[PDB]
Subunit: 290 residues, 4 copies
């Protein structure tokens, strides 16, 4: 089962928007060698919202190839429509993905019945496990505890990843669904607290620049070595707090560049961090560098 | 020559498989033109642009242009989160025969004004046809301030702005600020008569699809300053807006057009079509405004 | 029947919070001589949210005394509880108010029935007309058209004032309620547009610093002289954009001070406009 | 130093708004006896937003007299103006309060410099410790980490209580201020998680109906018996979930009534829980 640290991979592209498979390959290889427990391309940090059909496929294909089945590859599938999401899910599964991170984007408001049919449609489209994505603080259409409970009844919907800051929400989900739905968090949640209350891991952008420390934190929490976990959590939280002001995709791409990875810049109109903003990323990175 | 009057936000007719129904779109556009509308705007919010892929979008714009036969201008909605994608769309619709571009900025991560401005200038620089700036700060994650709007108006190709919010007072601030450099179009969230009173040049809306002759009549009455008659009509057309307000507009207009004989289909799932009970409520308002 | 321009009077106080009844009186008198059609103390611009019971009574009392029955005085009644609102309404009526501007403040969310009960309680406590206040864009608990329609059935709920920017909502109210509920707008709506669609007037802070022009605009609209009304409307609308990013009470108090009224400053924590910010007030005023 | 479980006391009043001191006293007494480490009157659950100046004083006085200095009493001070907040704070301190829970209510937006001036004024008005109240998810004007850090420099601002669901920000606060600002959470935060990350306790309404369990949870966390604490946390969290759809003051009052306290109903327009809703409260109380 999926667990531990899944870095939200940035999507490396050149000026023309062409995906850099080679750069993505060494990054994925290095992250795996650092001990990450999975990889998640096309998450928010991966700028899925700015990439077309071809670019997304290219991102997913490159990740799958570089991983070589070493760790599960959960591919983000975001769409406003059922047909498009189903097409993506089937394609990524066909390419070799191990899981689907189902993301519902909404334009016109949707009732709970419609919201449920979307996720159910994606699950019925593939044979690999689905991870429901949720963030009531950003999404125009999200999931109520009841909808989540009904979805967990699907044989292949077995995980959920909440990216809001409402950690209490996570405890309610676990109290309600137990093991039928394993919980993943994002950087908006304190990893140590998520693990304390019953979560199984986290998918986050920062894990890209601090993979070993993130894995270490995960291990400490699992071993119940809370005092040591918290020492480390405070330091890693300072990293998030520093990033919590910039476009996260632009932030991780800047940090990865400072570490030697030619990931390029975010897709315009997004702006790359300025020399001054980058200097700040540089300082936070150097502080936790081992 | 300048864009003015009533521009229906065309629905996007598709089958259960998602294939655009060019023939149905054709008869609809032809009927709207005969009804006297002043322009056509496919791929607006009512056209479900957010639910159509690059191939379906091209099929829609194509079908609309062919049908229009240059009888009225066709303003194609270009919506995207990226400059590259938006530029590609605009150049494509311009090539297909579009007379203007309704530039819609979709955002994920927040953007600062300079970036927001760069998006619109990229589109305007990519084509030679006029650009209509789309704005609705009540729904859009990244919208435009009056200063950005004023800077954008300085571009020779950006000559119109269409506001879909309910904030009519903002339209007057824009007019006071930009004057003729930026001609104002409203949507159904604004009262048409009020917009014309303060200086707007027309409106692009979904309801215009089911009440084209009445919309055109309202426009003319306002232009001729026959306010008493314009308002008698406005009060009636507003009741229609009020009834649709509780529904997914695209779902509403599609159900409305079906009642009028257009096999436009249902909205793109996960969107739901209006239920039988909801369709009766729509058939009700139509009957009341039917001339 | 209430109509025309109702200035949202600022509430003049000294640094100690003591109301300057003397200054309020001269202001009200000057506004009445300017031709305003009514006065509304304790509206948002009057900083009702920052004044205590005694301060509020002092403000209303000062306004009524200076008005001398020349124009109706509609007093703002804002509260989170029925008991407190009823107490204020009964007090202002006793002091001689001609109407009550009922404002529901909410902390915990309220269902429509409870919201409706708040307004009915105020209306049942007095014999003078009640003006329902509404601004869905700011209020925590507001009114749906259905609730407004039911409230309009009460014999004393005869008006509604909407402070949102959603002018379309006003037309929906008018189509639904007709003369059972006459509509007033605030500075967020374009005055001429409100009059065009059937509104009867407006209650706003900017009227305090440009009374005569505001009255002239109203008269032109009533006389259906739209061409001239719009020319004037375009000029007056500049005030709204100029104060857009500032505390409205701060703006009107600064403006009035520039016109010679010792109205004092907003009640702390609110800050008075800085010298730099005041330039926008000097500017728009010279322009009008 | 303030720590542990501080029940957010409900404010018992009759249908006419009169505070029931006798009732409040019996409730405080049993709470103290149950082991709570402190009492916090006039918090959100105490309907401070629906209570006038006199009622608030009655609540505070009734709580202090009942506590008999057995546990510290932190009185909620909520206001939109500095003058009113300072008066309240000085009064409660005078009555014998051990701390002030400063709550900033806003109408017009306030810049950081003004928000800071509000809290500092309160802190400058009393000699007892000040607890900064914050909830960015509900308050119109709240505090950034920078403002919080600046306020922590004040000799008497020594605690902060966050009622949002954003536990991550509590850690950001702890990392920045440390010992200078001890952190308290509320129902929206998972108590076990707050204690794990460095918090010192919590102030919440649910502690009123489940004091012994709440205290037990606290001790378990402090003793670092995380397995037992989490088993207990899961149960007590079912409580947070059950009320999620109701007025918290109405739930706690209904819950206390079921436990034998004649605390009465919430202040209208708020509605008391219906029978169907009280049965629900009955079940959660039975579950633990």
């Amino acid at each position: 089962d999926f667990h531990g640290v899944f870095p939200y991979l940035v999507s490396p592209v050149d000026a023309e928007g062409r995906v850099r498979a080679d750069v993505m390959g060494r990054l994925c290889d290095d992250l795996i060698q650092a001990g990450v427990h999975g990889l998640t391309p096309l998450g928010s940090t991966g700028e899925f919202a700015y990439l077309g059909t071809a670019q997304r496929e290219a991102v997913v294909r490159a990740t799958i190839e570089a991983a070589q089945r070493r760790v599960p590859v959960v591919a983000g599938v975001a769409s406003t429509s059922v047909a498009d999401a189903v097409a993506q899910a089937k394609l990524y599964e066909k390419l070799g993905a191990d899981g689907i991170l189902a993301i519902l984007e909404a334009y016109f408001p949707l009732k709970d019945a419609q919201i449920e049919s979307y996720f159910r449609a994606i699950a019925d489209a593939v044979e690999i496990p689905v991870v429901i994505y949720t963030n009531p603080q950003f999404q125009r259409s999200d999931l109520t505890l009841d909808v989540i409970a009904r979805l967990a009844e699907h044989p292949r919907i077995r995980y959920i990843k909440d990216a809001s800051t409402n950690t209490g929400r996570l405890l309610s989900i676990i109290n309600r669904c137990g093991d039928a739905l394993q919980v993943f968090s994002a950087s908006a949640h304190i990893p140590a607290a998520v693990m304390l209350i019953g979560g199984v891991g986290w998918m986050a952008g920062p894990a890209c620049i601090a993979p070993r420390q993130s894995v270490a934190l995960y291990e400490l929490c699992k071993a119940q070595r809370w005092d040591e976990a918290l020492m480390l959590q405070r330091k890693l939280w300072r990293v998030n707090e520093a990033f919590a002001k910039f476009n996260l995709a632009a932030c991780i791409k800047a940090g990865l560049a400072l570490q030697g990875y030619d990931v390029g810049d975010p897709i315009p109109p997004q702006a790359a961090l300025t020399a001054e903003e980058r200097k700040a990323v540089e300082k936070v990175l150097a502080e936790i560098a081992e």
